[PDB]
Nucleic acid binder design. Structure first.
Lengths: 435, 54, 100, 63, 65, 103
RNA sequence: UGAACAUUGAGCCUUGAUGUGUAGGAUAGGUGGGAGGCUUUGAAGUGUGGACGCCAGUCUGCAUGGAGCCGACCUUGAAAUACCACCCUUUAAUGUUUGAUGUUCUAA
RNA sequence: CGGUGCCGGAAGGUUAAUUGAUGGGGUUAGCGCAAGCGAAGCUCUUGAUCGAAGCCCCGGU
RNA sequence: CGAGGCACUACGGUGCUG
RNA sequence: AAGGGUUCCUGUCCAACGUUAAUCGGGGCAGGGUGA
RNA sequence: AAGGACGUGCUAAUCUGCGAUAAGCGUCGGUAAGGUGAUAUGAACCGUUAUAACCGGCGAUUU
């Protein structure tokens, strides 16, 4: 804890990135605690406890406590995630958009521009939608002034600016290095409530209570699902075979050495976060317009699938598998490997660069994400199954659990690799010189 | 057929495992500490912020 | 018995390397390395009795090394045999049930 | 080595070697040539253990 | 009538920001991957940045206190 | 017989390396040993891969002779044959270099 | 690597009949013994073959013959004869020995 | 048809190995005072005798 | 099998049809 | 056929070696390929 | 049998050693703190004074 701090402070490039990474997470909850004008936190706070929809609640835990208290970032990262994929699907549908994306850097930059103007259009639709939805029957709002044109107009302006800032803050820190703006926002929001509960439990009891018993069950579950993710992540699919022989001697034999070990064996990091972002995105807004004055049919469809009864589990689970397997197919890698091999003076047979190598990456890519997608659905049923006897825990198990493991495991996969050579270098230095 | 062919090559590619993953689970627990400790920082620094700006 | 345990040792290594052994292993036939045995009868009975595939007649051809132009001597890697063992039922690629 | 060979007998070693030869060295050596998993130490055993058993038989009909 | 006039202005702040990204894409692309280099510093348009964060902490004191 | 082992302390009879001691990390069959901090040369080591093989001219342990280094006993820098006369069920070393007889 | 039978030289002989010069009746190669045969089928006489036919003749095998021997119980010469040894021969049959050929055989 | 070669003939001459007659020599029992003669046995040398094909010769080609 | 045509393709070629 | 024995093809590389240059080759480098 | 042919290691040409029990296997003793023969010591591991390796006597396998 202390050691990792010295190590990342010691190399000056790491220091000043981890400065903004930490602070971003901090500034995320700065905004959430301080109410904004044109909407007041308290009226919103009771109104979301009463619910208009199970739909709304789900939406609230990804996006964080910035939708719970009436504050900027409320819409959150989730319209940008919904936008990026929708643009990528729309590229195939249109003849016109396909050409803009293919043509050079500038075309790919325009697509990327259209998506961020996209994102902001959906934000203004959601702020209109949310603002007028609330005080017209299911609740009432405003102590700054009572409802009216002024009240909704000012309300819109605030959240829109909020979302602009959020999208620019995510983009900023990707560029600089360390952490993604997608993982930053979801992570801040969900985990904020977690340490008081944990902190409470340790103090109260150690051999059991009731409240300890339910948390303790979830503690077995959490470790199981962590095991399974590190189980799928170890494997061997890296093929090593030196090109030619180039006489013998030197080491065990001096051949042109070409090691090609890619992959990791892990899928459903990025895709699982998209798949969930997308399906709640129509749904939540639909709910808002039918609790308020708007659509009653659009909401009904949302209910038909997502959670309410365990009959609806099988409809979210086909959609999860599907949206993940979709997202990966879009992401370019089924043939990346073969183009690289060519570029390097490293050649070989039994896997000769060109078309045959490509066919092998395309095989690899497919079975890999499909199996990572399957694990995701199993993981959900496992709390369901063990809870149908011993009580009904409702701590981190299912959706709650995956977000936390993926984020710490992504971030300290990349970050422990830098960190751990820093540690090694420190220890060997003390030992060789003085220390 | 078609769906059996996806399943009959996937049944031999289901391997991907190790033991000593309890090492990695001890670091999932240290990884958990980092999220508990960053969200406890929020309560600390954002409460100084609740004095001021709240 | 039909044959002993030492007439059930005849496979030490497959052959999968590139064209006509990845192409002619997926779409049709199958291929495996027969070191220096000089038999066909026992390679048919091998992947029956052990493993789980049934095959047609095993087809035999000698390969006169995979040449190395110059080495410590002149190179040259010693003789071996390639055999098309040729499936008729089971239609799997083997390496099922853990290594075989 | 020493005590290993000596604490076996005629009947015992016979039933142990079928396993050694076929699918404790057999599985390994095939796997190994295919890049799946080959560990050099593991080759040194099994191969040199089934071998050890056959010695005793023609030497003294079991140790 | 500060909240009404400055409100229209808050929207203005949204413009200069929505554009900063649109044009600020000579090394950024949604989920792109570009590790910076010798180029960077603090923008030229970061004056917009400071104008933003400052703008909302500003609506803090003005709105309630 | 032998004075070196795998934890031997020397004092060194090699010039520019006298008054210097360390453990004997490993014995070589070339009549060599590796003594600490002295066999270091600046070695022009290729950084092909950069982070998987180190750049620079890195200080790197060679090997010096066993017959131009000299044991330190436990009080004296004396070296002139060590006794194996004593048996504890296997040969044991002691000094006859000074005749102090500390094993 | 041999046998009978047949011929035919040559080697020892064994057993019978002469060994003729001149002179000597004739049968003297030489040497020695020597008046000797007196029997009655037996020489001789009467006849034969051979010896000489050179001087009457006898000799010597055999038929007749029981007829009592003969170098002439001469004598010439260097030696005298019968008869016995025997030089040696002329000559014949046996025992053979050997070398040639011939003939027939089988058993090498 | 002399010569030379081949074919044929033997009347006679010439003629090996082989068989070894005779002559000469050495030794000594014995006799001899010497000199010399020396049986028997054993030996050295000499060769009478018989010796074919071949040659000579007589024809033909 | 097939003169020749219908598709897409990296422009190497493959399928469809006769 | 004989004989050669991989010289065939593929990815690659040009210092020497093809009467020259040489990106190319049967040259350097190693694999892939001969199925009754 | 002498002598070969062809293999054989962790893998890879050849050398060294050895034979499908194949750079070894057993058995009795010596010996040992470092090692797994070489070009090329790498990858993996083993020993550490009493548990690697090497040496010698006997045996085994010896296509």
């Amino acid at each position: 804890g202390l050691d990792f701090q010295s190590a990342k402070g010691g190399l000056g490039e790491l220091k000043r990135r981890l400065l903004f990474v930490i602070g971003a997470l901090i500034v995320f909850r700065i905004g959430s605690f301080i109410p904004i004008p044109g909407i007041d936190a308290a009226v919103l706070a009771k109104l979301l406890e009463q619910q208009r929809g199970t739909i709304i609640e789900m939406f609230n835990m990804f996006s964080g406590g910035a939708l719970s208290r009436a504050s900027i970032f409320a819409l959150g990262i989730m319209p940008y995630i919904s936008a990026s994929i929708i643009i990528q699907l729309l590229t195939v549908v249109h003849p016109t958009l396909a050409e803009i994306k293919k043509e050079g850097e500038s075309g790919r930059r325009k697509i990327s521009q259209y998506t961020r103007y996209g994102t902001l259009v959906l934000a203004i639709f959601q702020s209109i939608g949310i603002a007028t939805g609330l005080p017209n029957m299911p609740g009432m709002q405003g102590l700054v002034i009572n409802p009216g044109f002024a009240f909704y107009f000012t309300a819109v302006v605030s959240l829109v600016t909020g979302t602009m800032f959020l999208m620019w803050l995510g983009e900023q820190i990707t560029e600089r290095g360390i952490g993604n703006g997608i993982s930053i926002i979801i992570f801040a929001g969900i985990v904020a409530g977690l340490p008081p509960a944990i902190a409470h439990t340790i103090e109260q009891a150690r051999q059991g209570d009731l409240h300890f018993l339910v948390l303790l069950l979830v503690a077995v579950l959490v470790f199981a699902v962590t095991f399974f993710v590190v189980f799928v992540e170890r494997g061997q699919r890296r093929i090593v075979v030196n090109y030619a022989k180039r006489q013998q001697g030197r080491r065990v034999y001096a051949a042109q050495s070409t090691h090609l070990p890619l992959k990791v064996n892990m899928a459903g990091v990025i895709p699982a976060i998209f798949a969930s972002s997308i399906i709640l995105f129509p749904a939540t807004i639909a709910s808002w317009f039918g609790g308020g004055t708007g659509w009653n049919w659009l909401t009904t469809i949302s209910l038909y699938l997502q959670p309410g009864q365990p009959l609806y589990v099988l409809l979210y689970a086909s959609a999860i598998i599907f949206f993940c397997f979709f997202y990966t197919a879009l992401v370019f890698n089924p043939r990346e490997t073969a183009d690289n091999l060519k570029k390097s003076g490293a050649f070989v047979p039994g896997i000769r660069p060109g078309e045959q190598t490509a066919k092998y990456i395309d095989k690899v890519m497919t079975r890999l994400t499909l199996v990572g997608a399957l694990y995701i659905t199993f993981i959900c049923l496992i709390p369901e199954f063990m809870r149908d006897a011993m009580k009904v825990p409702f701590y981190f198990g299912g959706t709650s659990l995956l977000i936390v493991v993926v984020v710490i495991m992504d971030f300290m996969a990349q970050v422990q690799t830098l960190m751990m050579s820093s540690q090694y270098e420190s220890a060997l230095k003390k030992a060789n010189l003085k220390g | 057929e078609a769906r059996t062919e996806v399943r009959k090559v996937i049944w031999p590619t289901r391997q991907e495992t190790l033991h000593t993953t309890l090492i990695v689970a001890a670091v999932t627990a240290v990884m958990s500490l980092i999220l508990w400790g960053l969200d406890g920082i929020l309560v600390r620094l954002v409460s100084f912020i609740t004095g001021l700006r709240f | 018995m039909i044959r002993e345990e030492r007439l059930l040792k005849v496979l030490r290594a497959p052959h999968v390397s590139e064209k006509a052994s990845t192409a002619m292993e997926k779409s049709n036939t199958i291929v495996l390395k027969v070191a220096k045995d000089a038999t066909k009868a026992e390679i048919k009975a091998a992947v029956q009795k052990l493993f789980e595939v049934e095959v047609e007649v095993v087809n035999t051809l000698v390969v006169k090394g995979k040449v190395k132009r110059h080495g410590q001597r002149i190179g040259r890697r010693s003789d071996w045999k390639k055999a098309y063992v040729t499936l008729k039922e089971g239609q799997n690629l083997d390496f099922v049930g853990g290594a075989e | 080595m020493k005590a290993k060979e000596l604490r076996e007998k005629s009947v015992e070693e016979l039933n142990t070697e079928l396993l050694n030869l076929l699918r404790e060295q057999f599985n390994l050596r095939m796997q190994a040539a295919s890049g799946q998993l080959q560990q050099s130490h593991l080759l040194k055993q099994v191969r040199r253990d089934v071998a050890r058993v056959k010695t005793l038989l023609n030497e003294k009909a079991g140790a | 009538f500060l909240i009404v006039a400055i409100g229209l202005v808050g929207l203005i702040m949204l413009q200069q920001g929505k554009g900063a990204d649109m044009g600020a894409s000579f090394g950024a692309g949604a989920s792109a991957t570009l590790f910076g280099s010798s180029g960077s510093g603090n923008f030229m348009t970061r004056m917009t940045a400071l104008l933003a964060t400052l703008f909302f902490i500003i609506s803090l004191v003005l709105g309630n206190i | 017989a032998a004075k070196i082992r795998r934890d031997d302390e020397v004092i060194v009879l090699t010039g520019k390396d006298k008054g210097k001691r360390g453990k004997v990390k490993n014995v070589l069959s070339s009549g060599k040993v590796i003594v600490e901090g002295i066999n270091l040369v600046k070695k022009h080591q290729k950084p092909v891969p950069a982070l998987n093989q180190p750049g620079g001219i890195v200080e790197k342990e060679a090997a010096i002779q066993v017959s131009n280094v000299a044991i330190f006993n436990a009080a004296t820098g004396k070296a002139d044959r060590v006794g194996f006369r004593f048996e504890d069920g296997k040969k044991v070393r002691f000094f006859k270099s000074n005749s102090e007889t500390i094993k």
